[PDB]
Amino acid sequence: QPEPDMITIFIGTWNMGNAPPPKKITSWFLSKGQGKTRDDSADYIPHDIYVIGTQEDPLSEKEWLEILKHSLQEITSVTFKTVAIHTLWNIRIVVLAKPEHENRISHICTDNVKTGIANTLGNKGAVGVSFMFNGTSLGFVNSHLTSGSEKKLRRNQNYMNILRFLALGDKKLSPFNITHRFTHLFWFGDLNYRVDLPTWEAETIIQKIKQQQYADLLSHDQLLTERREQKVFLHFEEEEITFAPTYRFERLTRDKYAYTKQKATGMKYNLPSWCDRVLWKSYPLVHVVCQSYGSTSDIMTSDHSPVFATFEAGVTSQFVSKNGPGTVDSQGQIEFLRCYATLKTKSQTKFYLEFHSSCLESFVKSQEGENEEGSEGELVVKFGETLPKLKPIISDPEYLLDQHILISIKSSDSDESYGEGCIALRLEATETQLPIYTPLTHHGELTGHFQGEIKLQTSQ
Ligand SMILES: Cc1ccc(OCC(=O)N2CCOCC2)c(C)c1
């Protein structure tokens, strides 16, 4: 029975509003309602992996798992296996997979981050899960960020705290945060970004939603505007939104948006907003295609509607050769030519690189580069032709061309990373000098660039 080169992944996010779910929630897992929806002809075809993020979840883990498994079994006639479940306060993540995937899944990690300080510590934060699916690493983050229309900068801070401190994936990738540790990273939840229009425009916004005219609302969505200004979720993707705002509804109908200030809201307005979102980041040139992104219309126990997103995701097999794993394959080599880093830093330490990849036996530390002054007042660190030749464990091009090299540029004085990035080995040619490029980030913000040429030797 062959190993897959593609799987499908369901991502769900639902802020349950502290209420139990209705008896039927199958529309969520079928990607039916508003937006980009799944074709009826696929209804019986199970996804490989289902990842369910809840916020304001009032259920026990047992209660919710029973509902989820019975829902999927009704749809698919498949009894899913529980990969992971992790809850922080009322924020929860569940990972279910087809039973045929049980021996494909390993290295399961869970973690949480609590955001805020004092007043603001005690109900917001994130839960996450990571694991290996054959040769592919998968990470999943469910975050419930700070609420309120005037707190977008707090949400951005919550995002940075979560990606700095959530401890998922391979701990040997010590310079790298979760935005570089996975082949595919999915980040979803009640991100709580609002449509930034005046309170006086509430009824106008409602009108627009009734007309399915979302363009003038999406142009004020705080998450889209913050992402365009590179304030949050740098280098993440989001499918186009074609569904109505998923917050704030009167419960037990979807006919009414409840936006007016009440004692129960702390006398805050809740204009209709896309609070409930799914974003992703995959390594360069890895197949990832969003096949649905929408909201349900028929689950009305909460003041939020559930959101679904589904993806085709490229995966690779657990490769064995006669040589690696357990030795190098001398028919393989990775050379970096004429490389230089450009850094936004004011510092004047010397810098060195670290190369990390599961195609290496262990990470590789370069010599220090040569600092020069850039024309427009930046630091250029030149490595020339000084970089160590990397010795992959397997030379077969069917393996090596699917791999990636993570790069960290570190201070010689402090050994701290000033920037992290990723280079694909999915090249147009082997035995050929070819341009490479990655942006560099640290704590998920832009700190520079790395560019140069690569020359990849495979056994072919
Ligand atoms: C499909 C699959 C499911 C679980 C699993 O390992 C983890 C496990 O067995 N757990 C017990 C129940 O709670 C979560 C942890 C693996 C390797 C594959």
Curated annotation (Swiss-Prot):
Disulfide bonds: none
One of the record's GO molecular function terms: phosphatidylinositol-3,4,5-trisphosphate 3-phosphatase activity
Annotated compartments: Cytoplasm; Cell membrane; Membrane raft; Cytoplasm, Cytoskeleton
Post-translational modification (record): Tyrosine phosphorylated by the members of the SRC family after exposure to a diverse array of extracellular stimuli such as cytokines, growth factors, antibodies, chemokines, integrin ligands and hypertonic and oxidative stress. Phosphorylated upon IgG receptor FCGR2B-binding.
Coiled-coil region: none
Effect of residue 288 to E: In one patient with acute myeloid leukemya; somatic mutation
Tissues in which the UniProt entry reports expression: Specifically expressed in immune and hematopoietic cells. Expressed in bone marrow and blood cells. Levels vary considerably within this compartment. Present in at least 74% of immature CD34+ cells, whereas within the more mature population of CD33+ cells, it is present in only 10% of cells. Present in the majority of T-cells, while it is present in a minority of B-cells (at protein level).
GO biological process: apoptotic process; determination of adult lifespan; immunoglobulin mediated immune response; intracellular signal transduction; negative regulation of B cell proliferation; negative regulation of bone resorption; negative regulation of interleukin-6 production; negative regulation of monocyte differentiation
Main location: cytoplasm
GO CC list: cytoplasm; cytoskeleton; cytosol; membrane raft; plasma membrane
Keywords: Apoptosis, Cell membrane, Cytoplasm, Cytoskeleton, Hydrolase, Immunity, Lipid metabolism, Membrane, Phosphoprotein, Repeat, SH2 domain, SH3-binding
Recorded family membership: Belongs to the inositol 1,4,5-trisphosphate 5-phosphatase family.
Domain remark in the UniProt entry: The SH2 domain interacts with tyrosine phosphorylated forms of proteins such as SHC1 or PTPN11/SHP-2. It competes with that of GRB2 for binding to phosphorylated SHC1 to inhibit the Ras pathway. It is also required for tyrosine phosphorylation. The NPXY sequence motif found in many tyrosine-phosphorylated proteins is required for the specific binding of the PID domain.
Summary of the function given for this chain in its UniProt record: Phosphatidylinositol (PtdIns) phosphatase that specifically hydrolyzes the 5-phosphate of phosphatidylinositol-3,4,5-trisphosphate (PtdIns(3,4,5)P3) to produce PtdIns(3,4)P2, thereby negatively regulating the PI3K (phosphoinositide 3-kinase) pathways. Able also to hydrolyzes the 5-phosphate of phosphatidylinositol-4,5-bisphosphate (PtdIns(4,5)P3) and inositol 1,3,4,5-tetrakisphosphate. Acts as a negative regulator of B-cell antigen receptor signaling.
Subunit structure: Interacts with tyrosine phosphorylated form of SHC1. Interacts with tyrosine phosphorylated form of DOK1. Interacts with tyrosine phosphorylated form of DOK3. Interacts with tyrosine phosphorylated form of SLAMF1/CD150. Interacts with PTPN11 in response to IL-3. Interacts with receptor EPOR. Interacts with receptors MS4A2/FCER1B and FCER1G. Interacts with receptors FCGR2B and FCGR3. Interacts with receptor FCGR2A, leading to regulate gene expression during the phagocytic process. Interacts with GRB2. Interacts with PLCG1. Interacts with tyrosine kinases SRC and TEC. Interacts with c-Met/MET.
Protein name: Phosphatidylinositol 3,4,5-trisphosphate 5-phosphatase 1
Organismal lineage: Eukaryota, Metazoa, Chordata, Craniata, Vertebrata
Record gene name: INPP5D
